[PDB]
């Protein structure tokens, strides 16, 4: 899908969705005023305004402040969303080093972790409204809401978000591993783009100044790269960072 938008971004998403689990991703985020660099659980179809419930859990690095990320739980329905934005410091800055971002989802709570340390845990409330299944996604784009992400600093493009690896665990309460309540299910070390596991976004949405396209996701040197660039300049010409 293609529009006249001058920029292209990326959205990586799992082809399958699941109910509950732990999701970890080792990554280095991208950040410039005006950008959004993320990791989120998402129930496909939530955007359908037919009275259907919205189910989503977010980790979003807003480009204007690379030293922190916003957490969020989105429930309710399209046009009538219920949110819970919170902010958490990340050191060193999200775009300066790799960190391990974790999301835990059970029937009773959602937990956010950075390098194994909890930064947020929500129990009940919106967690009870996270029904159904959710897929694991990551995207990199730029919001037209200057108040949320800051004025768009186009001069800083191109930008790249690097994903070293992803681990997904099944929710095994009381049956988990090492005493925990999660059992490792699968891991992707991104030595390749595995199309049997992931999809690449190929759409855009209002408020996004970029087209999400398949040309903005690729792998090199054990890293999955998400690119935010001007249209036609999606290729990465640098050296992949080491973790």
Contacting positions for Ca ion (CB under 5 A): 164-165, 189-190, 222
Number of neighbours of residue 183 by Cβ within 10 angstroms: 15
What string of DSSP letters covers 107-143?
A: SSEEEEEETTEEEEEEESGGGGG--S-BEEEEEEEEB
Report in angstroms how near the CB of residue 243 gets to Ca ion at its nearest: 7
Beta carbon nearer to Ca ion, 51 or 238: 238
- Residue nearest Ca ion by beta-carbon distance: 222
Indicate which residue of 24, 60, 104, 234 is catalytic. 60
Number of neighbours of residue 78 by Cβ within 10 angstroms: 15
The first and second tokens of residue 209, run together, are 């100044």
Beta carbon nearer to Ca ion, 62 or 223: 223
Report in angstroms how near the CB of residue 25 gets to Ca ion at its nearest: 11
Report in angstroms how near the CB of residue 164 gets to Ca ion at its nearest: 4
Indicate which residue of 56, 118, 154, 234 is catalytic. 56
3-state secondary structure of 230: strand
Report in angstroms how near the CB of residue 72 gets to Ca ion at its nearest: 27
Q: Catalytic site residue 60?
A: yes
Beta carbon nearer to Ca ion, 113 or 164: 164
The first and second tokens of residue 207, run together, are 């408020």
Beta carbon nearer to Ca ion, 42 or 138: 138
Residue of 183, 116, 152 lying closest to 31 (CA atoms): 152
Per-residue burial over 202-212, b if 16 or more Cβ lie within 10 Å, else e, is eebeeebbbbb
Catalytic positions:
56, 60
């Amino acid at each position: 899908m293609v529009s006249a938008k001058d920029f292209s971004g990326a959205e990586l998403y799992t082809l399958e969705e699941v109910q509950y689990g732990k999701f970890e991703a080792r990554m280095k985020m991208a950040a410039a005023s005006g950008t959004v660099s993320s990791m989120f659980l998402y129930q496909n179809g939530s955007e359908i305004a037919d009275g259907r419930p919205w189910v989503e859990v977010d980790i979003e690095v807003l480009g204007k402040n690379p030293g922190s990320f916003q957490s969020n739980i989105i429930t309710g329905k399209a046009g009538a969303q219920k949110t819970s934005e919170k902010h958490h410091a990340v050191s060193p800055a999200a775009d300066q080093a790799f960190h391990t971002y974790g999301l835990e989802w059970t029937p009773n709570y959602v937990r956010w972790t950075v390098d194994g340390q909890e930064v947020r845990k929500t129990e009940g409330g919106q967690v009870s409204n996270l029904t159904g299944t959710q897929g694991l996604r990551f995207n990199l784009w730029s919001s037209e809401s200057a108040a949320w992400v800051g004025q768009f600093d186009e001069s800083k493009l191109p930008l790249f978000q690097f994903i070293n690896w992803v681990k997904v665990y099944k929710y095994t309460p009381g049956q988990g591993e090492g005493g925990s309540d999660f059992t490792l299910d699968w891991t992707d070390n991104f030595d390749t783009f595995d199309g049997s596991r992931w999809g690449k976004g190929d759409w855009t949405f209002d408020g996004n100044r970029v087209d999400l396209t398949d040309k903005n996701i690729y792998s090199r040197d054990g890293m999955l790269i998400l690119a935010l660039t001007r249209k036609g300049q999606e290729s990465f010409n640098g050296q992949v960072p080491r973790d």
